[PDB]
Curated annotation (Swiss-Prot):
Pathway membership: Xenobiotic degradation
Native source species: Piscinibacter sakaiensis
Highest taxon of the lineage: Bacteria
Residues that coordinate or bind poly(ethylene terephthalate): Y57, M131, W155
Cross-referenced InterPro entries: AB_hydrolase_fold (IPR029058), FrsA_esterase (IPR050261), PET_hydrolase/cutinase-like (IPR041127)
Uses, biotech or industry: Has potential for application in environmental remediation and biological recycling of PET and PEF waste products.
Protein name: Poly(ethylene terephthalate) hydrolase
Substitution effect: W155A: Exhibits highly impaired PET degradation capacity relative to wild-type PETase. Also displays decreased enzymatic activity on BHET
Length: 261
């Protein structure tokens, strides 16, 4: 267990920001990816786990930026990345996500870095949108020591993620016409037998339903923070929120397995 911050409430996890103070910086010399913003917290008590977030095809940090402060304010170091090319495919995106986690761990050891010793480099998570969500699931399949994964509107050329043992949360957008739920998100979710997993489908959601500026930041933010706290911190105070079937008009579908209360 790695418990930091007060006992959460649905209300405080729905809030725009958690208890901790967040400052950010642009990574100076990115190592094995295009660009990175690091978001961190100053007064967490101990060190916090790190999460690397990757956008979709043609997209940049903009699409996924809101997660940086939303997660960091609850006790994580979060790096949002631009890929080497906006036209990088999921396997390449996974490689770059893992290179960003690698560099976050190096900046942890770098006296000139604002996250100097602010990071616990044994507790790492992966997140991403679309092809970046596909990348996150590849990162989880290839690296089972990752503590948690969350993909929003994921897309990959293959829907078989049966090797994934990492607790995985899938955000789906009901009306997605880019990576439709019935051919992408759902099939990907159904492939995972060996892990804690969850599927939350956003009612009437387009492909961008979990991106910066979305109309469900309360519910989506609550779920992603609760999932990452539960599984990255092994913090059982978050079990109620991580596993709950939300009683919301904003949710069109909910599935979960191996998520014990």
């Amino acid at each position: 267990s790695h418990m930091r911050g007060p006992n959460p409430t649905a209300a405080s996890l729905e809030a725009s920001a958690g208890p901790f103070t967040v400052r950010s910086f642009t990574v100076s010399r990115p190592s094995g990816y295009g660009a990175g913003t690091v978001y961190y917290p100053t007064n967490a008590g101990g060190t916090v786990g790190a999460i690397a977030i990757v956008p979709g095809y043609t997209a940049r940090q903009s699409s996924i930026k809101w997660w940086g402060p939303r997660l960091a304010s609850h006790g994580f170091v979060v790096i949002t990345i631009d890929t080497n090319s906006t036209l990088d495919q999921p396997s390449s995106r996974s490689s770059q996500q893992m290179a960003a986690l690698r560099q976050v761990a190096s900046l942890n050891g770098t006296s000139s870095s604002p996250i100097y010793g602010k990071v616990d480099t044994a507790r790492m998570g992966v997140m991403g949108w679309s092809m970046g969500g596909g990348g996150s699931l590849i990162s989880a399949a290839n690296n089972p020591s990752l503590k948690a994964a969350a993909a929003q509107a994921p897309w990959d050329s293959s829907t078989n993620f049966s090797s994934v043992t990492v607790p995985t949360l899938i955000f789906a957008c009901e009306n997605d016409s880019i990576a439709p739920v019935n051919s992408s998100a759902l099939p990907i979710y159904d492939s995972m037998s060996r892990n804690a997993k969850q599927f939350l489908e956003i009612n009437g959601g387009s492909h961008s339903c979990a991106n910066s500026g979305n109309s469900n930041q309360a519910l989506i933010g609550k779920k992603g923070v609760a999932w990452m706290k539960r599984f990255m911190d092994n913090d059982t105070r978050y079990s109620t929120f991580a596993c709950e079937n939300p009683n919301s008009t904003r949710v069109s579908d909910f599935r979960t397995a191996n998520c014990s209360l």
